Amino acid sequence: GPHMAVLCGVCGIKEFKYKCPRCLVQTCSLECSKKHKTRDNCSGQTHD
């Protein structure tokens, strides 16, 4: 690949696969998606 990839906004050690509708954080997995929720107060429903 041409190395045109974005890193996980949370852990940033491989790549992203998700993108929180609120935080817009491109997470690598649901684990990183649920990671910001417990500290940033997020549910991930866009208008939660």
Q: Which residues are annotated as a binding site for Zn(2+)?
A: 8, 11, 20, 23, 28, 32, 36, 42
To the nearest whole angstrom, how small is the minimum distance from the Cβ of residue 27 to Zn ion?
5
Annotated binding site: 8, 11, 20, 23, 28, 32, 36, 42
Q: Which of 6, 22, 45, 47 lies at the binding interface for Zn ion (CB under 5 A)? A: 22
| Longest CA span, the chain | 37
Using CB under 5 A as the binding criterion, the count of chain residues that bind Zn ion stands at: 10
Nearest to 42 by CA among 23, 28, 29: 23
What is the Cα–Cα distance from 41 to 33, expressed in whole angstroms? Answer: 12
